[PDB]
Every structure is written in structure tokens, then in C-alpha cells.
Amino acid sequence: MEPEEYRERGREMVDYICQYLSTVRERRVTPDVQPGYLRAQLPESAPEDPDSWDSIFGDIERIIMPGVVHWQSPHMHAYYPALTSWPSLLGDMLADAINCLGFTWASSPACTELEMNVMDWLAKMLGLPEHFLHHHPSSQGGGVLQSTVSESTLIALLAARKNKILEMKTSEPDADESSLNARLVAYASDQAHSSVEKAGLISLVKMKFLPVDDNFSLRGEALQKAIEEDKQRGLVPVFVCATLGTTGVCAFDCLSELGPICAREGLWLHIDAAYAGTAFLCPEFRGFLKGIEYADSFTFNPSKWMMVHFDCTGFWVKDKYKLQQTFSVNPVATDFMHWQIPLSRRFRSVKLWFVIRSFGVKNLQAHVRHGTEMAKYFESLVRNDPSFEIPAKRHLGLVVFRLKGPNSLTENVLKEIAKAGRLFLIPATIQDKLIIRFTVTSQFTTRDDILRDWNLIRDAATLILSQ
Amino acid sequence: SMEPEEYRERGREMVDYICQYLSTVRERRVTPDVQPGYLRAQLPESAPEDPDSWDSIFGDIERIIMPGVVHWQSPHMHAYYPALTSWPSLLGDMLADAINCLGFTWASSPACTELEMNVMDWLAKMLGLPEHFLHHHPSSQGGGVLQSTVSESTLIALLAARKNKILEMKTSEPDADESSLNARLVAYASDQAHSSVEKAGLISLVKMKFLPVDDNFSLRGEALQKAIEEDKQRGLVPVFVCATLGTTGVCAFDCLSELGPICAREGLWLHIDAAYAGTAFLCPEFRGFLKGIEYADSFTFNPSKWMMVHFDCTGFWVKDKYKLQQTFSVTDFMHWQIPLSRRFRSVKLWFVIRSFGVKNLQAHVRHGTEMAKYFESLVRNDPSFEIPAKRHLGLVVFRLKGPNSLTENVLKEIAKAGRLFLIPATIQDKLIIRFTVTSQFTTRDDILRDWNLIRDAATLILSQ
Ligand SMILES: *Cc1c(COP(=O)(O)O)cnc(C)c1O
Numbered sequence: 001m002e003p004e005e006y007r008e009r010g011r012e013m014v015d016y017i018c019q020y021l022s023t024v025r026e027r028r029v030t031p032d033v034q035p036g037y038l039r040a041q042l043p044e045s046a047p048e049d050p051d052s053w054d055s056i057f058g059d060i061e062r063i064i065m066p067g068v069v070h071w072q073s074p075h076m077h078a079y080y081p082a083l084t085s086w087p088s089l090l091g092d093m094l095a096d097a098i099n100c101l102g103f104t105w106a107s108s109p110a111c112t113e114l115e116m117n118v119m120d121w122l123a124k125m126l127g128l129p130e131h132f133l134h135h136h137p138s139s140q141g142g143g144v145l146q147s148t149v150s151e152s153t154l155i156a157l158l159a160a161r162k163n164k165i166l167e168m169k170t171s172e173p174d175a176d177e178s179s180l181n182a183r184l185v186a187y188a189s190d191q192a193h194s195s196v197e198k199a200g201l202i203s204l205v206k207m208k209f210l211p212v213d214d215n216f217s218l219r220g221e222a223l224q225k226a227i228e229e230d231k232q233r234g235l236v237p238v239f240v241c242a243t244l245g246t247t248g249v250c251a252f253d254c255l256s257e258l259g260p261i262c263a264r265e266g267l268w269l270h271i272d273a274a275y276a277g278t279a280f281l282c283p284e285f286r287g288f289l290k291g292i293e294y295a296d297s298f299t300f301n302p303s304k305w306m307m308v309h310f311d312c313t314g315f316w317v318k319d320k321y322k323l324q325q326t327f328s329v330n331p332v333a334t335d336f337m338h339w340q341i342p343l344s345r346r347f348r349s350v351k352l353w354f355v356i357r358s359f360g361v362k363n364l365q366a367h368v369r370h371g372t373e374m375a376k377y378f379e380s381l382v383r384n385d386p387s388f389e390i391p392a393k394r395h396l397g398l399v400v401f402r403l404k405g406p407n408s409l410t411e412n413v414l415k416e417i418a419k420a421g422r423l424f425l426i427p428a429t430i431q432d433k434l435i436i437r438f439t440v441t442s443q444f445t446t447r448d449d450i451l452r453d454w455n456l457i458r459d460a461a462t463l464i465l466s467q
Numbered sequence: 468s469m470e471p472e473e474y475r476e477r478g479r480e481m482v483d484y485i486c487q488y489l490s491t492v493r494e495r496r497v498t499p500d501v502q503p504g505y506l507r508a509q510l511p512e513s514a515p516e517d518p519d520s521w522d523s524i525f526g527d528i529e530r531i532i533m534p535g536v537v538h539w540q541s542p543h544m545h546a547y548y549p550a551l552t553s554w555p556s557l558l559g560d561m562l563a564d565a566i567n568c569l570g571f572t573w574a575s576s577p578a579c580t581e582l583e584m585n586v587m588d589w590l591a592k593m594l595g596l597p598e599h600f601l602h603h604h605p606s607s608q609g610g611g612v613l614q615s616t617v618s619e620s621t622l623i624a625l626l627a628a629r630k631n632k633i634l635e636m637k638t639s640e641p642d643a644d645e646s647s648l649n650a651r652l653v654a655y656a657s658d659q660a661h662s663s664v665e666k667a668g669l670i671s672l673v674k675m676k677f678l679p680v681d682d683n684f685s686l687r688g689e690a691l692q693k694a695i696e697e698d699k700q701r702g703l704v705p706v707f708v709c710a711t712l713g714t715t716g717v718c719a720f721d722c723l724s725e726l727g728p729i730c731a732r733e734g735l736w737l738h739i740d741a742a743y744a745g746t747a748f749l750c751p752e753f754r755g756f757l758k759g760i761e762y763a764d765s766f767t768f769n770p771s772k773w774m775m776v777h778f779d780c781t782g783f784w785v786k787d788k789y790k791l792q793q794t795f796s797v798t799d800f801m802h803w804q805i806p807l808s809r810r811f812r813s814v815k816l817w818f819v820i821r822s823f824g825v826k827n828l829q830a831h832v833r834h835g836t837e838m839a840k841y842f843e844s845l846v847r848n849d850p851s852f853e854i855p856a857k858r859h860l861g862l863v864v865f866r867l868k869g870p871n872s873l874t875e876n877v878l879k880e881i882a883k884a885g886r887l888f889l890i891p892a893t894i895q896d897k898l899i900i901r902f903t904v905t906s907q908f909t910t911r912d913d914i915l916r917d918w919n920l921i922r923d924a925a926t927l928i929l930s931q
């Protein structure tokens with residue numbers, strides 16, 4: 001295609017996107033396809049000659065959309081949100097056209113410098129300590145963009161185990177790094193995201209999952225007991241992942257208790273705030289952050305609730321030296337290749353910059369407040385209905401609930417709802433109880449959307465209960 | 468704040484701006500004249516409370532962003548390896564960014580998984596890869612998955628190799644710790660291998676040893692054979708080899724016909740890093756360097772280098788998907804990578820392959836190689852310069868005959884104007900200029916223009 005055709009096709013794609021995102025409520029959120037559905041609808045080989053743009057573009061509706069889960073539907077209520085926005089789109093359009101790589105400052109200065117200044121903006125927006133700012137005079141720390149919280153959590157564990165091994169190796173300098181690694185133990189809540197287990201599996205570091213209280217919250221007592229038990233057995237506590245907004249029921253570990261324990265015992269304290277971190281834009285949701293001064297690292301996903309399209313993860317460290325010694329064989333700008341697993345990285349900071357500036361802080365805060373109010377409204381509808389119960393507290397955009405009685409009633413409600421797929425729910429379990437997780441997603445979700453989805457859930461319960 | 472009708476106006480503005488930027492890019496200075504820290508004073512200290520105007524946001528692109536950008540899409544970009552964008556790549560990712568689905572499981576968005584499976588089978592075939600790397604082949608236990616980088620794909624290969632061997636070692640020592648057993652492992656690559664190989668060992672705590680190479684900077688069977696016997700004699704356990712097709716320094720090619728047989732016989736995971744040169748295997752006449760690919764356990768290259776897909780987009784193929792899965796689980800692609808979440812990267816890849824078609828992708832590789840061949844002829848006509856390694860694809864390496872200081876001062880002179888972007892490399896003692904043909908729009912005129920700036924620089928240095 002010629003540049004003049006790109007100008008026409010770009011317009012067709014902008015007009016397509018505007019219509020798609022505007023009318024998304026009309027779509028079946030979940031596709032009704034079987035595994036392998038696509039192969040028989042595609043040629044077995046790449047085309048030798050150009051396919052026409054009418055043919056490629058045609059295939060969006062004809063064969064892509066029928067297999068898509070519409071993550072931007074107000075009726076998507078599974079997992080946690082992953083929200084796009086107009087500004088996000090426009091910013092990545094620019095980054096993808098420049099298509100520079102920013103492994104070093106030198107390889108494209110703007111790619112590193114915009115990211116450095118925007119991560120300082122974002123740390124301030126979240127109410128993070130000044131020691132996570134690149135530009136605070138006394139700081140040895142800073143923020144860097146990653147693709148996922150999963151990888152940011154793995155990097156934190158990699159930095160914690162490398163740091164501790166280098167300190168152990170000064171005493172046993174004939175001892176293999178890998179042998180010293182055998183003695184380490186890392187902790188999280190039994191509510192922690194599967195990425196914590198997976199970071200242990202990848203790093204070959206022992207991971208212990210600790211019991212929680214009645215609010216599904218990891219407490220200092222449980223960490224202190226595990227540390228004493230594990231040191232008595234010759235293990236070397238190295239790392240704690242404290243979760244702010246667990247995946248299951250959006251619970252919060254008790255940072256004010258875990259912080260001092262991590263500081264006194266020499267454990268790297270990493271905060272996984274993947275979903276909930278966006279709420280810290282609002283001063284009234286910062287109570288969960290109490291104890292943040294003890295953190296060695298902090299991560300959240302703008303790519304969940306802050307209307308930046310995926311990939312966009314914020315990762316902040318107190319000590320960029322400890323991070324860089326993980327990733328370089330020898331220990332106002334920076335080469336971000338030493339703050340991450342790969343070499344290459346792209347100009348992800350444009351889309352984050354455009355979202356922050358297009359909305360401004362007040363409209364980002366209004367979005368968080370609105371989504372939370374939509375979840376509160378949903379909650380009030382459940383709480384009013386004595387057929388249902390709510391087995392965990394709602395703090396943000398996630399309500400969990402179930403029909404009173406055996407798990408099978410809730411199982412059968414989810415099955416009935418999945419038949420038409422007008423809203424997308426996935427089950428979880430908390431201890432013995434099957435629950436429905438209801439995540440408020442789209443920034444455009446209205447009270448009418450919430451009542452519409454509640455009424456479908458109620459119709460299904462009425463069907464299952466009336467037999 | 469921004470409304471749907473405003474998105475349609477600003478989307479048009481951005482489409483027109485991008486077309487004008489990519490079309491006029493030769494008029495830019497490829498290297499920006501800035502110093503570290505230049506942007507901080509040009510930006511507010513804090514995010515804006517109220518919305519900034521779209522005129523202000525857009526206006527900042529030229530006013531404060533472009534002055535610090537290295538124009539990777541410039542024909543005058545000749546450092547590192549290419550990273551090419553294209554109209555169809557842009558249009559596919561626009562769609563992917565709007566849907567914004569995540570593909571950790573098939574269930575979480577089937578199309579994200581299924582388009583990727585099918586396109587990776589297309590791309591395996593386009594490359595001339597073994598049928599055992601296809602998702603849909605009756606005998607295959609393998610398949611292709613997109614990754615963000617070759618760096619991460621090489622790390623995964625090594626994590627899969629070391630996990631598989633530790634599980635085999637535990638059968639005879641059930642009391643030994645997985646991390647204790649990892650201590651005995653050793654992994655190999657060429658001393659020309661990309662720094663991502665060294666970085667994989669540093670992350671995984673796997674001992675890496677870098678092997679000497681021959682007169683063509685090729686890793687040979689004998690070096691591997693000698694390393695393997697010496698390491699076994701010391702009580703280390705060979706586990707992995709990374710064979711490079713298209714080394715960073717001089718685009719040398721490891722001898723896979725020799726390394727293959729040894730890896731298979733000795734039970735070593737053989738990972739192929741063809742980051743740059745992979746794209747060349749679209750053209751059957753460059754497939755000589757792929758001879759011995761039937762012995763590979765894994766293979767990776769970047770469409771995000773030379774195939775005109777914008778970054779990120781890396782292909783990673785394994786022969787044994789169960790070995791890969793065992794690395795990451797105590798088709799759902801979350802078990803074929805490090806993270807859980809992943810995005811719909813396959814749209815822009817499908818769009819590029821369909822919008823160009825294979826024949827035009829082959830013409831692009833061949834034209835880039837012709838431009839490199841013309842750059843080569845201009846150097847080889849001029850007896851002030853020499854060429855210490857053979858040009859197989861789009862990289863020419865060359866220096867001034869004489870001490871390193873001559874080539875050094877040429878680079879420092881070219882850097883003053885930044886009219887083309889060149890990076891120093893070394894082989895043994897010799898300082899070299901790498902000359903990479905990048906832009907798919909590169910012409911003989913662009914090459915001669917660029918050569919004449921290197922010559923004009925050389926003329927000045929040679930009479931100081
Ligand atoms: C979503 C989530 C993650 C995983 O984030 P990715 O960016 O998908 O890796 C981890 N922890 C929590 C608490 C989450 O909600």
C-alpha cells in the first residue's frame with residue numbers, strides 16, 4: 001500500500017474503532033466458538049501476492065470479532081479490568097510509527113527521558129514516597145515501565161535473591177551462587193496471584209504461602225512465625241510480596257505490620273498493587289498504602305483500571321543499584337536495559353503521557369470514584385436480596401457474592417448466564433464457597449448498565465431457585 | 468474529557484502526521500543534538516490537574532518529543548540492526564489496541580490465541596522451518612508463540628533446558644535441591660553471541676562459557692566437542708547451546724551442520740538465535756545457513772528487525788511444548804512464556820504478511836541486500852578502507868587501514884552533524900564501523916549520499 005492509501009485506510013480504521021467502542025454493549029461479550037474454530041476459516045499458507053485491503057479489513061467482522069471476548073464491554077465482569085481509551089490509542093499510534101528502541105539513553109533519548117519524567121509524575125499521583133522518584137535529590141531509586149506485574153514481581157525477586165547471594169558470597173566465596181540460592185525462602189499471602197508461585201518456579205527460590213485472617217489479609221504475626229520457623233531450619237528469608245487488592249476478593253495485606261518485620265529481618269518487601277494501585281490516585285483510598293515507606297519495590301497496572309491499553313505496568317525501586325546488579329555482570333538519565341529482563345524496549349511512555357494529560361488527574365480520580373460507586377450500587381442490589389450473600393468486603397470495583405445454600409445453585413446460575421453470554425462472569429472459590437466475582441470494568445459503565453446486569457443475574461437465580 | 472467525534476478528528480490528524488513524518492524522514496537529522504537530562508526542564512514537574520488541550524498535546528510532538536528522538540525509520544539510520552515499521556503493521560495494532568483483550572488462556576479471548584497459532588504456522592513455513600515446529604502438523608509436539616524480544620525467548624529456552632535436566636537429575640538424587648542441581652549445569656554460545664545470552668545465565672544462575680570461533684567468526688563443532696569433554700571431566704553437566712545465525716558484530720553464522728549432531732548425541736538443548744538473519748530465510752537462496760535446523764530444540768527471530776512489523780514482535784518455536792510448559796506450570800499461551808497476561812500481537816503480523824504477501828517480503832530482503840552489496844562495492848573501490856568480515860545480508864563492516872584512532876576520529880566527525888547514525892564495534896583488536904541497511908525505502912541514492920559523508924569524514928581525518 002502507498003502512503004495515500006494509508007491515509008484513507010487509517011481513516012477507515014479510526015472510524016471502525018469509534019463505532020466498535022461506541023456500540024460495544026450490542027455485542028455478545030463472550031464468543032460462542034469451540035477450540036480450533038479458526039483454522040478452517042484461514043488459508044493453510046501465507047498469500048504469495050498482496051491480499052486487497054477490502055479483504056483484510058473485511059475479515060475483522062468476518063473472522064476476527066467472532067472469536068473475541070469484548071474486554072471493553074460494560075458487561076465484561078470477569079478477572080480485573082483492562083481498559084483502553086481514545087488518548088491511549090492516539091499515543092501508541094505515534095510510538096508505533098517512530099518505532100525507536102530505548103535499550104540505552106543513546107539509542108533514543110526521548111524514549112528514556114519521557115518515561116523518567118512520567119514515572120515521577122505517576123509516583124506523585126499515587127502518593128508514593130519521594131525515594132521512588134528519579135529526580136528527588138537524595139533518591140537512589142526510580143520508576144520504569146514493564147509489560148506486566150508478573151514480570152515486575154519476578155524482577156523484584158531476582159533483585160532480592162541476587163542481592164542476598166552477593167552478601168552471602170563475601171562469607172563463602174567458593175560457594176556457587178546457585179548453591180546459596182538453595183537456602184533462600186520467599187513469602188506471600190495464600191491469596192497471592194499465581195505470578196508469585198511462578199516467579200519461584202522460574203528462579204528455583206522456595207516460595208511459602210502464609211495464612212490470612214478473617215479479612216483474607218496477611219498479618220505480621222503470620223510472617224514473624226514463618227521467619228522464626230524457617231531460620232530455625234537453616235533457611236534464609238529473602239523476600240515478601242505484600243498484595244494490595246488480591247485477585248480473588250480484592251483483600252489488602254497489612255503493610256503497617258509487614259513493613260517493620262521486613263526492615264528488621266532484612267527481607268526485600270515488594271508490593272503487588274496490580275489492580276488497586278490506580279485507586280491510590282484518590283486520597284480517600286490511600287489507607288491501604290499505610291506502611292509504604294518500608295517497601296523496596298512497588299508495582300501496579302495502569303493497563304488494568306487507569307485507561308491505558310496493555311502493555312503498561314509501573315515498577316518502582318528504592319535502590320536502582322540493587323536492580324542493575326541483577327541484570328549487568330559488573331554492578332540525569334539511565335540505560336533502562338539494566339532495569340529489566342530483555343535488551344530492547346519500546347516508547348510505551350507516550351500513551352501513558354497522553355492518557356494522564358488528556359484526562360488530567362481530576363478526571364482520572366472521577367473515573368476511579370465512578371467505577372467504585374458502580375460496584376457499591378451493584379453491592380446494594382445483592383445485599384437487598386435475601387437469596388444472596390456477600391462473603392468478602394468490597395473496597396473498590398469488585399463485588400463477590402453467591403446464592404445462599406449449596407455451591408451447585410451458584411454453579412447453575414453461572415451456567416445459565418454463560419448460555420446467552422450477555423455478560424461475562426468467571427467463578428472463584430474462597431475456602432469452601434463457590435463465588436461469583438463481579439468486576440466493574442468500562443469507564444463508560446452507567447447505573448443503568450449495572451441494573452441491567454444485576455437483573456440478568458436475578459433472572460438466572462429465579463430460574464435456578466424456582467424449580 | 469476527549470469525546471468520540473474529537474477522537475475521529477484527532478485520529479485523522481495523527482494518521483496524516485504519521486504519513487508526513489514517515490514520508491519526509493530523510494529531511495530529519497537521525498541523531499538528536501541533546502545532552503542527558505535535556506527534557507526535565509521542558510516538562511511540568513507534576514501531571515496536569517485539568518485536561519491539557521489536544522492542540523498542546525499534539526504540538527508537543529514536534530516541540531519537545533522529536534528533538535530527542537533517534538529516527539529509527541530513516542534510511543540514514545545505520546546502527547544496531549533495523550527495527551522497521553510499515554503502514555499495514557500500524558493499522559493492525561490500531562485494531563488490537565482498541566479491542567484491548569488479554570490472551571493468557573484461550574477462554575480469555577479465543578481469537579488472540581487462534582490467530583497467533585495459525586499465523587505462527589504460516590511464518591514457520593515462510594522461513595523453511597521443520598514441520599515439527601508447526602501447531603497443526605499430525606506428528607508435531609511443538610509450536611510457535613510470539614514473544615516481545617529474542618532476549619526473553621533465549622532466556623525461556625535456557626529456563627526450559629535447565630528445568631528439564633534438573634528433573635532428569637532428581638530421578639537419581641531425590642534429596643538434592645533443584646537449585647543445588649542447577650549449580651552443576653553449564654551452557655555454551657559463540658564468543659560472538661549477543662549479550663542476551665550472558666544476561667540469561669546471570670538471571671538463571673547458569674554458568675555460561677563462550678566458545679572461540681574460526682576465521683569467519685563461525686562457532687565450529689570441534690570447539691563445542693572440546694568444551695563438553697573438559698566440562699564433563701570437571702564434573703559440570705552440559706545442558707544448553709545457543710547457535711547464532713547472524714551475529715550482532717559482523718553477521719557471521721554458527722556452523723549448525725556441525726553443532727546439531729553433537730547437541731543431539733550429547734542431550735544438549737540447541738537454541739537458535741536468528742534475531743536479524745531469520746527474515747532472510749523468507750528467500751530460499753539464503754537458507755544455506757539454516758542447514759542442520761532439524762537438530763534445533765528451539766528457534767527465534769525478530770519480524771521486529773527486518774520484516775517491517777513494528778516492535779514488539781518476536782517468533783519463538785519449540786520442538787517440545789511439554790518441556791516449555793513444565794518450566795512455567797507447577798492452548799493457553801500463559802504456559803509458553805514468563806508472564807500471565809499477553810496482548811493480541813498477531814493482528815499486525817497477519818496484516819503485514821497479507822498486505823505485502825510473501826513475494827513482496829522476499830523482494831524487500833533482496834533489495835536491502837542489493838543496497839548492502841552496492842555500499843560494499845563503494846568501500847572495496849577505495850584503498851583507504853578495508854572489509855575484515857564477509858557481507859552475507861544487509862550489514863557491511865569496514866574500517867580505515869591504519870591505527871584504530873583513524874576509524875575512531877571518522878566516527879567522532881560523522882557524529883558531529885549526526886546526518887547518519889553509526890556505532891563503533893570491535894573484532895579482536897580492530898575498531899570497525901558497522902553499516903546496516905535499514906529502511907525498506909532505502910535507494911542507491913541514499914547509499915551513495917551516506918557513503919560520500921563517510922568518505923568526506925575520512926578525507927578530513929586522513930590529512931589531520
Ligand atoms: C492482575 C494481577 C496480577 C497480574 O498482572 P499481569 O500484569 O497480568 O501480570 C498480579 N497480581 C494481582 C493482585 C493482580 O490483580
Ligand SMILES: *Cc1c(COP(=O)(O)O)cnc(C)c1O
Binds near residue numbers: 342343617715769
Ligand atoms: C538484535 C539481536 C538480539 C536481541 O534482540 P531483542 O529482541 O532486542 O532481545 C539478540 N541476538 C542477536 C543475534 C541480535 O541481532
